[model samples]
Target: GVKKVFTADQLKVAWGDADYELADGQWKLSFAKQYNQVKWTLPESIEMSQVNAVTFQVADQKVPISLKVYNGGDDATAANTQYGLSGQTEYTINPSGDGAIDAVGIMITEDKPENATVSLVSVTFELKAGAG
Candidate 1:
């Protein structure tokens, strides 16, 4: 297996409405309400079956309150749930029980003590590129 990475510049917003921006190879989101989110997308989809793991990095300790993974077309979600791991800057997605992965998104998830920002920086994929 091998690894490939994509910087913030390589992703686009699939859907969001919280004063978010992606530029200079960095992604920033100003969240003021619950449901404030950014669905990050790539130019193409990657088959989850062909990947072993995925790492999503958040910058400046601004980790999203919640996160999810989508499989390109129709947007079937991986794990069918939202993820929130506070005090963590990076999250790893396991491909063993998932399908294709087209994009990842961050959500505010809760209204309690709202008012925050998320700084996303990169994504790394560990691919099963060998004949084994």
Candidate 2:
């Protein structure tokens, strides 16, 4: 079941050297840094024990992706990475620990730098059907 739907209103970027905006139902970004990242800080916390999944919808990704989570604070994420993700359009992640979550981080590492552009079509949280 859907726990939340995120838009640019709360989906604002926190870090990354890129020019971007949400349009055509996707976030179009022109990245300038070899190591670029885009993050979304939730307006409300998601119970780490309650969320079944955290999902991202992406596109035109030429590099691999990674994720970080804040259990309500900034801290290490085991190499600044929790989940080393792929460039697939759809990504579903089941978080590893118990805590109330306030932020989600997404990173794109271009080991071989190039002209990079990426698209984010959607971002959301999933919960058990009965979680309401």
Candidate 3:
């Protein structure tokens, strides 16, 4: 089951162990492996047609992972030509989780067209089980 949903502002409040304060307009919420267990949920509802997938890049660790939705949109041709995302990039959750959820941070970028509005459809976090 899903836990708490936090807006971008609320997420900034809980970041950094509730201690460190980030400068206004700062992007890229930093997270340590120690805080990995807490799941972060999107604060808003995203339209399936707006986004194709959510991607994460851990620069320090050189780790990159991308999760996509299967039925995010109806236009395959437009999605590819405009959004640059294929159907394989969409994702849906199965058997949600319940717990104290938090938003670590976010990075904002411009849309490919530069002048068009790029709406954010959703935010997703993937959790892994403990090592066997």
TM-score, each model? Answer: 0.80, 0.75, 0.24
lDDT of 2 at 49: 68
Against the reference, the lDDT scores of all candidates come to 0.71, 0.67, 0.27
Tell me how candidate 3 scores on lDDT: 0.27
Local accuracy of candidate 1 as per-residue lDDT tens digits, 1-132: 787788898888878877788766788778877777778787677777787777778876443466666765554354633466677778877654455677877777657534487788888888876813
Clashing pairs in 1: none
TM-score for candidate 2: 0.75
**Looking at model 3, how many pairs of residues clash?**
10
lDDT by residue (8-114, candidate 2, tens digit) is: 44576656555678787777776666556666677888887677777777787755666666565565256324454664787877665657877776665666556
**What shift in Å separates residue 120 of candidate 2 from its native position after superposition?**
1.2
Q: How high a TM-score does candidate 1 get?
A: 0.80
Q: Local error of candidate 3 at 17, Å?
A: 5.2
**Candidate 1: RMSD over Cα atoms?**
2.7
Off by over 4 Å in 1: 62-64, 73-82, 96-99, 129-132
Provide backbone clash counts, one per model: 0, 0, 10
- Which candidate has the highest TM-score of all? 1
**Lowest summed lDDT window (length 10), candidate 2:** 75-84
